[model samples]
Target: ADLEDNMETLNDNLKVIEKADNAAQVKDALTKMRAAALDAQKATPPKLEDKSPDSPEMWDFRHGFDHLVGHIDDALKLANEGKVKEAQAAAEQLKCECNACHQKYR
Candidate 1:
């Protein structure tokens, strides 16, 4: 449930990027949630043991978050060049990444 909510947040933040009118808006959207990504990365899984985040499973979870952040960066760059569709595509994949990770992990 904790992870689910985190993904929901990421999903919500990127929704605006999916229909962004300009690079600045997309960049600002991602920037406003910068700390959110960090918080999600540090979230405790409610359905699992509270292991050290150093564990392989926890690292796997954290890795996807880092990738999501990277995708945000990718989308921002593409939008910066006025590639709206390309940036939206990156946002789409970022959402997909969240879904797939949650499915596999918990």
Candidate 2:
């Protein structure tokens, strides 16, 4: 339930990133998403509920969030530099990361 709510927040912010007209907007969206990414770091996917916390599968889950955080951070840095296009490109990688994780765990 927590992860679901966090994902909704992430998705909402992602839409903002997609439609953003300027660096400030993208920065704000990414900042909010970074927070949610951290919130999601500890959550196990519904299908992975039976996996032990220390299992390799769970590490992959955490690793997925780690990539999300890094992507957001990279995007945030680009936004801070007023590089909206570069930031958006970095932000675009987030979707790839999501897909990678979901393909395995969703």
Candidate 3:
């Protein structure tokens, strides 16, 4: 699905941004991720439209996906501003979000 594709792109961009050795590379990766997030927003399913009490899959998927991507975007912005420590912390938070989501859903 489009949402999955966008998440893949966003994750890839995050990896690249984290490993970037220069500001230019970081900026470029951030731009790519921001675009991917925007695309994801368009493709994501409506919240509260589909859910099963026994299965919180869709709800967790939606919230976790958005939260992780948002945190990554925040990290990117911090890194761009030369706030390395803050950016690293944000990246850790993003990673935690991803792990938590995967444990619950996939």
Assess each prediction's global lDDT (C-alpha) against the native.
0.72, 0.88, 0.64
Best model number under lDDT: 2
Q: Which stretches of candidate 1 lie over 4 Å from their true place?
A: 1-6
Leading candidate by TM-score: 2
The digit string of per-residue lDDT tens for model 2 on 48-98 reads 899799889888888889888988898999999999988988887688888
* Candidate 2 residue-wise lDDT at 77: 97
Q: Clashes in model 1: which pairs? A: none
User: How many pairs collide in each candidate, listed in order?
Assistant: 0, 0, 0
lDDT string for model 3 (6-92, tens) is 779868876775676765566677677767766765553444335553346555565665775676677778878877656655654
Clashing pairs in 3: none
Order the numbered candidates by lDDT, best leading.
Answer: 2, 1, 3
User: Which one wins by TM-score: 1 or 2?
Assistant: 2
Alpha-carbon RMSD, each predicted model: 2.7, 1.3, 4.6
What's the C-alpha lDDT at position 64 in model 1? 74
